[PDB]
Amino acid sequence: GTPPPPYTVG
Amino acid sequence: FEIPDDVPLPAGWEMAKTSGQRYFLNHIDQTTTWQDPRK
Numbered sequence: 001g002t003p004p005p006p007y008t009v010g
Numbered sequence: 011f012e013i014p015d016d017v018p019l020p021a022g023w024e025m026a027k028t029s030g031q032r033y034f035l036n037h038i039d040q041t042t043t044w045q046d047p048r049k
Binding site: 010 | 026027028029031033035037040042044
């Protein structure tokens with residue numbers, strides 16, 4: 001699939 | 011033109027690569043451009 005980039009909401 | 015929209019790379023940004031698509035990494039705010047930072 002297409003996972004989002006790292007660094008998500010804290 | 012590549013991401014023209016009269017707006018080049020977003021200021022205060024640092025694109026990178028997740029684990030194609032690519033993105034400008036909106037670390038300044040709290041998300042990531044998945045198509046265009048301003049279009």
